[PDB]
Design a binder for this molecule. Sequence first.
Ligand SMILES: Nc1nc2c(ncn2[C@@H]2O[C@H](COP(=O)(O)OP(=O)(O)O)[C@@H](O)[C@H]2O)c(=O)[nH]1
Ligand SMILES: *C\C=C(C)/C=C/C=C(C)/C=C/C1=C(C)CCCC1(C)C
Length: 388
Amino acid sequence: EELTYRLFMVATVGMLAGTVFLLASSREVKPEHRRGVYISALVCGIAWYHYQKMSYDTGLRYVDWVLTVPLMFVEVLAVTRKGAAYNEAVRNWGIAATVMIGAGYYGETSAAGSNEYWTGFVIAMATYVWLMRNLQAEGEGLKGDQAVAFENIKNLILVGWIIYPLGYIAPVVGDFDAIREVLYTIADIINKVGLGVLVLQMARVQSGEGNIFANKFKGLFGKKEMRILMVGLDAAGKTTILYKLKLGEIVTTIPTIGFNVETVEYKNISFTVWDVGGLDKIRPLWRHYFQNTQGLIFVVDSNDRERVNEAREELMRMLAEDELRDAVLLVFANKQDLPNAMNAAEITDKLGLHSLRHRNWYIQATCATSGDGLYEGLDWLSNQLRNQ
Ligand SMILES: Nc1nc2c(ncn2[C@@H]2O[C@H](COP(=O)(O)OP(=O)(O)O)[C@@H](O)[C@H]2O)c(=O)[nH]1
Ligand SMILES: *C\C=C(C)/C=C/C=C(C)/C=C/C1=C(C)CCCC1(C)C
């Protein structure tokens, strides 16, 4: 009695602290890797609100499970599934979890050892095994650090959720009516807080420059046609950016002597790269690549203070082209890691971006060698071209 009540007090302070740790740790992870951490904090918030209320009514616990369990499948399936396979998995797992929790409440509210007690146990165990068998099959396409991090998510549920049927069986294998609530509370505190930490641990590892398996920049553009021109002075870092995106092989062509072109194609997205400036006889040939250009990326070496003025003249002359009147401008203030590098505010000032009228533009300080800022700039450019 007095011991079964002390755990209800610790879990209440535990679920709130879990929400406190997850929300406070969501700052040290990239914003694109926060959707799972926020849902994990929502799970601990729903648990804290119910564990404050919880002669002892068990319906408050099953109301907590019927809401949090499918939400924990949401933060798990989002790691492996994306589109149509995601909504079909969340729907099936959410239905299976509803039948599991529903069958348990049907049997637990009945008399222990009755036929309704075991009927609810059988159906719940069947859906329980179904959910666990599908969880084992998930993550087959994951590689590297995400495969390891998702394996910890799999093992925590596969092992941690065993406590629940054991707590359900306890009242009939002995005089263990309070052990059922103890095992439920320990399992709720361990699984819900633990999964949030593992989702946070996954977000910490996902938010990084590591792109061995070339997945970081994949889910930004979608399926629409998107022709992107990425230009800038020589040595600005353009070829380095193309390698960092890891969206495909760089196709290098020399249509005429003195004119070098690089292209990368992925789905219906494309980047075309050449140097601006140089000989005046090469300039007219750029016109053969301007039509139907949606995004214009200008890469500038922020450490080259001697040629920052020549970079502006090339940008403005490019923006004067009538075929690029609707092109969305994205300025990459590259090489921010160098000691003499000008910040994004000074690059905007020296490039005169505030004088541009009727032009949807954005400047992003980047380090192409490490990849910092590349995702933020492309995410903005993708948002402009998809939502227009
Ligand atoms: N420190 C630093 N160096 C960079 C960065 N981006 C490119 N570079 C260097 O710039 C040199 C040439 O860049 P490159 O990609 O060929 O520029 P491109 O001629 O416009 O294609 C390379 O040796 C890179 O090491 C960066 O963000 N930081
Ligand atoms: C707080 C959220 C969690 C992970 C709750 C999980 C509960 C279950 C896995 C319990 C299922 C049951 C089974 C497998 C058999 C008897 C009836 C139960 C509902 C206790």
